[PDB]
Each structure stands twice: as C-alpha cells, then as structure tokens.
Design a protein around this ligand. Structure first.
Ligand SMILES: COC[C@H]1C[NH2+][C@H](C)CN1CC(=O)N1CC(C)(C)c2ncc(Cc3ccccc3)cc21
Ligand code: NA
Ligand SMILES: [Zn+2]
Length: 105
C-alpha cells in the first residue's frame, strides 16, 4: 500500500543490522526460519508471520514451508537494491523466469 523503495538507501536504517532484525522475532513459531528471514533483510512486525524488508519496506505474510525468503523477496519486491547487492541480477532473473514459468504449468 506504500510504494516500494527502489533507491540505494534503506527505508528503515534502524533495521540495517542483522542482529537488530533478529531481535524483532522473539520466540518464533512459524514455518520459516527467522535467521533465514533476517539474512534476506526481513524483520518481524509482531503480527503473525508479517515481515518487512529494512531496505525496500516490502511486506510479506503467510509463510508456507515451501516458500523461500530470498525467492519471495525477489518475486514481490524485484526493485529492492538490497536484494540486488546480496543476490545479483543473474539470480534475480532465474527466480523471475521460474515464477513466470510456474504459472504456464
Ligand atoms: C498473496 O499472498 C501470498 C503470500 C504467501 N506467503 C509468501 C511468503 C508471501 N506472499 C505474498 C504476500 O505476502 N503479499 C503479496 C502482496 C505484495 C500483494 C502483499 N501485500 C500485503 C501483505 C500483507 C502485509 C502488510 C504489511 C506488512 C506485511 C504484510 C502481503 C502481501
Ligand atoms: Na514475537
Ligand atoms: Zn527489500
């Protein structure tokens, strides 16, 4: 509902450190690994399994065990500069192609 941040500056610099992000989860009952989420730039909002990226501000919920933090970050927030720094455009391309071909079948 807010536009995604596509600049090279994080929207939430307080959540720029891995450990700051990790503290937001507390006891975490959900399908997806909190360290894997924090590594993908996500921090917990404290409302179910709602997460936001510190950089793009992008929000995600309802984590299925088959859903990967980085893959989901690329699917929904392809313009995130943090995603690009960490993963590269080659990875990001694969993910898009895979998702866009998942639809076909
Ligand atoms: C359609 O859903 C599918 C799920 C399934 N599980 C994975 C991990 C992710 N998928 C996308 C997702 O969660 N999306 C997509 C979209 C961009 C349309 C969106 N908009 C709002 C919310 C709710 C929210 C608000 C504020 C902060 C965090 C979340 C969630 C959401
Ligand atoms: Na919590
Ligand atoms: Zn992001």
């Amino acid at each position: 509902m807010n536009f995604p941040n596509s600049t090279n500056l994080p929207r939430n610099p307080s959540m720029a450190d891995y450990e700051a992000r990790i503290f937001t989860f507390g006891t975490w009952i959900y399908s997806v690994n909190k360290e894997q989420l924090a590594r993908a730039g996500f921090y917990a909002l404290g409302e179910g399994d709602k997460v936001k990226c510190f950089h793009c501000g992008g929000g995600l919920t309802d984590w299925k065990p088959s859903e990967d933090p980085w893959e989901q970050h690329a699917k929904w927030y392809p313009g995130c500069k943090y995603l690009l720094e960490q993963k590269g455009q080659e990875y990001i391309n694969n993910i898009h192609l895979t998702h866009s071909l998942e639809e076909c079948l």
